[PDB]
Protein: Serine/threonine-protein kinase PINK1, mitochondrial-like Protein
Organism: Tribolium castaneum
Amino acid sequence: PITLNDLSLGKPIAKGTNGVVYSAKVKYPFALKMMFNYDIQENSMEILKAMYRETVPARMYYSNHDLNNWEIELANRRKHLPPHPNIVAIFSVFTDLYPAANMSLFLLMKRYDCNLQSFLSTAPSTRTSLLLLAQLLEGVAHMTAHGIAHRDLKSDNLLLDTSEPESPILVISDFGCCLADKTNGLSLPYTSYEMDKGGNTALMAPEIICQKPGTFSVLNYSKADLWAVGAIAYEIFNCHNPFYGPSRLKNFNYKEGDLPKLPDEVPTVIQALVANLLKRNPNKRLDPEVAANVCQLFLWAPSTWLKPGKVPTSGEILQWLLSLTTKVLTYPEYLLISSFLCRAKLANVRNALHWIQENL
Amino acid sequence: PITLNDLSLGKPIAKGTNGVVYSAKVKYPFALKMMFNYDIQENSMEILKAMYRETVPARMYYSNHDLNNWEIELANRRKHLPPHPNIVAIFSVFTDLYPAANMSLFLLMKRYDCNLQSFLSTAPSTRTSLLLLAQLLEGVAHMTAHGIAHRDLKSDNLLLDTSEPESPILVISDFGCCLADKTNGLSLPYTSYEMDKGGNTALMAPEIICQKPGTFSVLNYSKADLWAVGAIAYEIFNCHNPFYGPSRLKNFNYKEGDLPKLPDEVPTVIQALVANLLKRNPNKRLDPEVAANVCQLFLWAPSTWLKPGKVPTSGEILQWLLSLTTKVLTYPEYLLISSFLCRAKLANVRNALHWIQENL
Ligand SMILES: [Mg+2]
Ligand SMILES: [Mg+2]
C-alpha cells in the first residue's frame, strides 16, 4: 500500500478549518485529502462516521497504529464500493499524525480537471450530454447494486476528466453523506427527527424529505439517488435545475405538472426517462438497473429497437450483447459499454426494451 | 320514484341491532334494507357516512323531509356509480321513519340467491370460474373508470343470480366502505393514522396497508380493488385464499414467491393475470381496463390471437369488435360481451393483446 513516504507534495488545492488537500505525486496528478482530528477524544462519533464514509470507495486501507474499537466497528459495519470508472478513484486511505511535513485521516485520490457545473458553463454537444447522463446513471446503478446510497449527488461534486473535451469521463465523488451499512442496506429506521438523513439539501428525494419519524417508519433509499439524477439531467441539457434558484421548486411540494419541458434538442425517449426519474412516488420510478439500460439502449441498440415497428428474441438479445463485447475488444464510449456489459442480465435489458416501446 | 306505499313486505331476511332487511315486492324478488338512526342526533358522522356510502350505486333518491345540511354535504361530495350488470341493483333509496308498519335509511334492491363463498362450496366448472373472474374484473373496471374504489371486496359480498347454475351473474355489493368523493377521486390525503382507510381487513392492497401518514402522503386506490381480485381469484378456482386462514399470508409482508401455484386446470395466461394482479407494486399491475380485456380476449378472441404465431391490425380489431356486436343482437355470456363492447377502446384492446403475447 502507498503511504506518505512514497509520495511528494506540491501546492495546496484546498485549505480549511477541518482539513487540507494537497496536490501530490509518487517518487502532480494525485490529491491527498487530509481531515483533522480523526480521534474519538477530539470529535464525536457522528463527525467520525462522516469522515470514514468518505472512504467507502477506497481501493486499499493501511494502518500504522493498532485499531481503536470505534475504528474496527466502523470498518466492519461498512459496505464497500468496488472500483468503477464512474466512481471517484481513491487509491489509499491511511491514518497518520499533523507532522510528516491531530491524528489525521488521509485519502490519496486522482485529481480531476473540474466539476460538472464548470464544464456546463459552456453548452456542450447534445451527444456529450447523453454520454454524461449515461455515466451518471451507470454510477448510481453501481452504488445501488451494492447497497449504497450517495444521498448528496449534485453538479458541484460530480467530477470530470476533460482529455477529449467532446466526451469527458464523469465520476461521482464526496461520499461523506453516504449510506453504506452492512446491517440495514438501503432501508434505514427513522425513529428520532434529529437523525442523519443524508445531505438535508435541495435534491433529497420526496420519499425521504416527506417521511415523518416513528417506529419503523423506515426511510427507503433504493431509488433516492435516481431522483437527484433527474434534477441534474436538466443541468446536463443546458437548463436550470428546476430545484435550484430563488424561484424554485421544492422536493416536498412540487407537483409533476410544475416541471419545465426540456428543449426539443433532447430526444423524446430521454425526456421521458427524466420525467420518470422525477416522479414523486418511488414505485412509479424505474429500477436503476433498468434506467441505466434505457440510456445504454438509446446509445447502442440497433435502430429497429428504438423505432415503433419489432420482433425481440431472447437469443437475439444475447447475440447483440456479444456483438457489443467484440466491438470493445472514444475512451468514454468503451468504459460505458463495458460498464453496461458487466451488469447486463437478460431480464433487465428486456424490461428496458419494453419501457422504451411504451414511450413514443 | 318507488316509496314504501308502493310495496308489500314479507319475511325478514336479516335482523340486527343496527337495522333489518325485509323481503318485498310491488303491489318477493326485492329486498328492502333498513338502517336505523340515520340522524346526526343519534349517530356520529363516521357511521352516517358509512350508511350513505351504501347508496353510491343507487338508481333513484327520494326524500320525504327537507334535507339537513349534513345530508346535503354528503350528497354533493359524492361520486355516483352508474348502473352496470356486475354492480348490485339498488332501485330506490329513501329516508323514512320507525313506524309505517328512528329516522331510517331504506334501500330497495334486487334479491340475489347466494354469495360467492356459498356457490363455491361445490367446485364449479373451470369455464364457470373464468366467467366469474371476467365479471368481477368488469365490475372493478366500471368502478375505476368512475373514480370509485370499493375497498372491501371479498367472497362474502360478491352476490350471485344462480338461474342457469352453469353460468351465474356476479355483482359487487355492500358499498359501505367505498371511496366515492368528487373532490379527490382515488387519491386520498392521509394525514392522521386514525383515518378511515376502507375495511381495515385482510384484502387491503399492499400500497394502502404499508403507507405511513404525513403531509401528502397520499393513498392511491387506483389499482387496489384489483389486488383483492387477485386473492379472490384463488377462491374462484377452488383454492384457499392465500390471505385467509390460520397459516396465512399477510398483505404487508408477503413476498411474491410465497404465493401458492394455481392448479394446472386454470389456463397459463390466466395464472399470469392473477400473478400480475397480486404484484406488490401497483405500477407493475395492469390497468383495470386492460386486465378486464385480458379475460375477455381469452374468452372470445380468434384463437390465432392467443397462440404465439400473429398479425394484429387496427382495422382487423375493429372488424372483430363488430363481429361481436352482431353476435349479441347463455345470458351471462351476453352481459359480459356487451359490458366489454361498451368500454372497448382500440388502444386498450391492443395493450391487452400485446400483454397476452408476452406471457406464454
Ligand atoms: Mg462532506
Ligand atoms: Mg357495512
Chain A is about 35% helix and 15% strand. Residues B 50, 174, 176 surround magnesium ion (ligand 2) (CB under 6 Å). Chain A touches chain B at residues 210-212, 214, 217, 252, 281, 283-284, 354 (CB under 8 Å).
